[PDB]
Amino acid sequence: SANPTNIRQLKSDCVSKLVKIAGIIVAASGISAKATRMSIQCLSCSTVIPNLYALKCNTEQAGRPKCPLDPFFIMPDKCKCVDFQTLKLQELPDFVPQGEIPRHLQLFCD
Amino acid sequence: MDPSIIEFIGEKCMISIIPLIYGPVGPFRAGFPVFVPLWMATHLRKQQKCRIVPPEWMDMDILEEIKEEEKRSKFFTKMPCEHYMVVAQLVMSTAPDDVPRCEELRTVIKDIFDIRESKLRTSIDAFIKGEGTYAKLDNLTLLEIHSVRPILPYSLDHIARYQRTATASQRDTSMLS
Amino acid sequence: LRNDFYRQLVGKRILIVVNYDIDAICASRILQALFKYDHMLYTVVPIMGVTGLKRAYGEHQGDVKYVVLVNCGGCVDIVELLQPSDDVTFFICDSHRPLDVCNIYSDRQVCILGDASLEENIPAFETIFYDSEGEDEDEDESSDTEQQHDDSGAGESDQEDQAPRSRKLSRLERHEQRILKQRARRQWESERDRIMFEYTQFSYYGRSAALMVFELAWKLSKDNMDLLWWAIVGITEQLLLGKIESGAYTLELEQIQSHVSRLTNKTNDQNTMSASKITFENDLHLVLYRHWPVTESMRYSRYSSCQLKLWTLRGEKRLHELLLEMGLPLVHARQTYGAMDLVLRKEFFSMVERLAEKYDIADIVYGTFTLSYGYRSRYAAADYVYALLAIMESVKKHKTPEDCFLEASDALSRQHKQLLSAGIDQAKLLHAAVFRQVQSSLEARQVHSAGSFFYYVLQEEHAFFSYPYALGLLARFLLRGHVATSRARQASDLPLIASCPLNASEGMCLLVGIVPVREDSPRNFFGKAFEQAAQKSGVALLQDFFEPAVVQLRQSDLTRFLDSLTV
Amino acid sequence: IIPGDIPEVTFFNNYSKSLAAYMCSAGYNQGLPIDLTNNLRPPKSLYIEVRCMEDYGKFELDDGEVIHLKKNSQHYLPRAQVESLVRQGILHHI
């Protein structure tokens, strides 16, 4: 993008669900950094991540020698990259923000 | 350069149809095909008088083979009557009133129309150094080149002051415009 | 019939596109097509009343011989109107049922599309235009009139036994020579027990404007399925028994079924984009069922509001408690049906047909159509006439009303639809500006008994209702509320009045009125009733409209008029 | 047919005389001020009225009773009259 909603009604019942609501913005951050993938000396495989844990050594097979307990030293010159802002807003000015206090939401720009 | 310069033109071609005016056209007879220029089927189908079936290139096999044939075309390709950007305009307007398979039709034509222009920047991204006497029509179509016809050529003269000037005009050691 | 006369239709003509209606543009915009089909150039006209009729044809005074009559005819013995009619043919496809036979007979430039169950007006021209008393169309004792005049031999002609005609009774003497007048008034008037009972009791309308035109063109191998949707506009305009009595509603469930359950240009390849072949569906004629939440309907429905009293809160307590039996959500009961979750909008209608069984409103479901253009949409059959009348906007720029009549004719094209949603900007807000004085009415109890009817008048205008037809609606909206629900039948059922403030147009007291509830087929004496006070006195009255049920007074010549109107 | 709604007239008359060359060959060897800008109409019956879209200037001098050339410039105007204009506020309609 149809039809809006409010914030005083949304919980587990409607989780992982896409909604239209409205408020008035307050302030938020700048833009820093993100990435998705790169690789490491230890295995030299792309840092394949689903979501936008931490691993076997694999600097091992030189005959016998192992090297467990995670010597994974990231090589970011191999990497990818995305954006962020991390935003924030306040809920409506007509739905009892006076006798109550205004609740709000935390956000993620890409 | 126009929408209807082609329709001045392309509908002049003729095909055998289904339904005497002087012309190679014969008189009209029920149940009996008749080759006509295509500016009557206007005046039949929209007149709710008769149908029409297409030429032979109009299919989803011969040109669902061309989808790979023109990957030879570092230069150009197979050209079934060159005018499938105009007839299909009017055919697919009214022909599918009873005609089947008006879709992959509609697919491929954009799936070939927009594409052979998508090369066309590329080959035009090879022009260097006033390369005026190198060009390409080698198996060109009919209804494309108008979409660049006004732009660069009414540019290149104000370039060709300095591009085409070399092979008959000279100055001192530096280049001349 | 014009399978032969249509063969004539080549030379010049005028296709006037008859007075203010939906059905006209439905049954005419079709014909701007056919004329360019046979290579005819055309010209077409806005009509609002008899004003437009000759004020323009006086500008078009030719002898253009092929001429229309639809939505008209009950005005003049229209040769009396258009005296320039010498042989200039007219053409009859009008829906106005009560018309004069003077335009049927003297059948010079008129064509009777006649088939009906009324054999009651047979010699009515042979006496009415034929008789008189104290009459001069005769010889005399003077030697000047002893010649063959227009000796009508009738109540026009002599009463001294010099008259060929009048074989109805004796001419020598019944008991005297002068009893001719006596029998003349007897024969004149004794049938006016029926004749003047015609045209002076009520008025109502006939039939379609292009259903024949479909069938006329059905022979032409024309499966313009689009035009059927153009057709049904005129159908549900006034086939809807919610507005106007059809009966054929429930009998053309056979015919147009016998059209389109029959007529299938594609039994095999119909499931694609442009204008898929149509469906009949058993649906509602509910108040804009589809495109906005239930909570618009559940207030704005007269069929709900007639039985349940929803302007107040008990309705709503009754409402939701009946939504118990469905157990609908509420957030979803306040967003658009099309916008709701999906199994609900899908499953919804199926149960309402059955679980409206017990709650006094069983007759919300009717029979209808539905179709599309493509995949942006699914327009709805019944969901179309109401956005139209937002373009019938009563703006006083002097430019809008004629011109916006043209926009309507540009409206029903597939190409022209951005405009169309603008009605929906306008329409719903009207439909809930409906209440805007109603609950101020039902509790103010501004219903006036006023003797042998019920009576209301408004005294403050709406920019909305400067435009006239909603005046009927508000009238049709409220008497259910108080007058029909807090009462018995003896003290409830009587007709009503509905005044229109012209707070801008200098003050002239416009009005319409309508029958009581459950008395529909009792046609409205308001076809004449307002002539009651006017015929007796009359004060600056107008019947300038083509419509019967329509009037215009002065600001202050309505009450003693109404006092005369007591009866 | 319809000059400006409002020594240029001498240049216009010179241009009108210069256009004659065109008119001579146009329509026939002998010449016809040739219809180029109106009536793609197939010609139909000759005597039916007109409609416009708020034209202005009021120069219709063509063979009619009185037209009053704007929208609803509409009187019993024959074919000889109605041969004037297309896209200066006119052709919603015939």
From Swiss-Prot, chain A:
Highest taxon listed in the record's lineage: Eukaryota
Full-sequence portion shown in this chain: 124 to 245 of 733
Quaternary structure, from the entry: Component of the Mcm2-7 complex. The complex forms a toroidal hexameric ring with the proposed subunit order Mcm2-Mcm6-Mcm4-Mcm7-Mcm3-Mcm5.
Function of the molecule: Acts as a component of the Mcm2-7 complex (Mcm complex) which is the putative replicative helicase essential for 'once per cell cycle' DNA replication initiation and elongation in eukaryotic cells. Core component of CDC45-MCM-GINS (CMG) helicase, the molecular machine that unwinds template DNA during replication, and around which the replisome is built.
Family, as annotated: Belongs to the MCM family.
Protein name per UniProt: DNA replication licensing factor Mcm5
Subcellular location(s) of the protein: Nucleus; Cytoplasm, Cytosol
Cystine pairs: none
UniProtKB/Swiss-Prot annotation, chain B:
Name of the protein this chain belongs to: Probable DNA replication complex GINS protein PSF2
GO cellular component assignments: CMG complex; GINS complex; nucleus
Lineage: Eukaryota, Metazoa, Ecdysozoa, Arthropoda, Hexapoda
Signal peptide location: none
Family matches, as InterPro entries: GINS_A, GINS_bundle-like_dom_sf, GINS_Psf2, PSF2_N
Primary localisation category: nucleus
Keywords: DNA replication, Nucleus
Function text: The GINS complex plays an essential role in the initiation of DNA replication.
UniProt GO BP: chromosome condensation; DNA replication initiation; DNA strand elongation involved in DNA replication; double-strand break repair via break-induced replication; regulation of DNA-templated transcription elongation
Similarity field: Belongs to the GINS2/PSF2 family.
SUPFAM superfamilies listed in its UniProt record: GINS helical bundle-like, PriA/YqbF domain
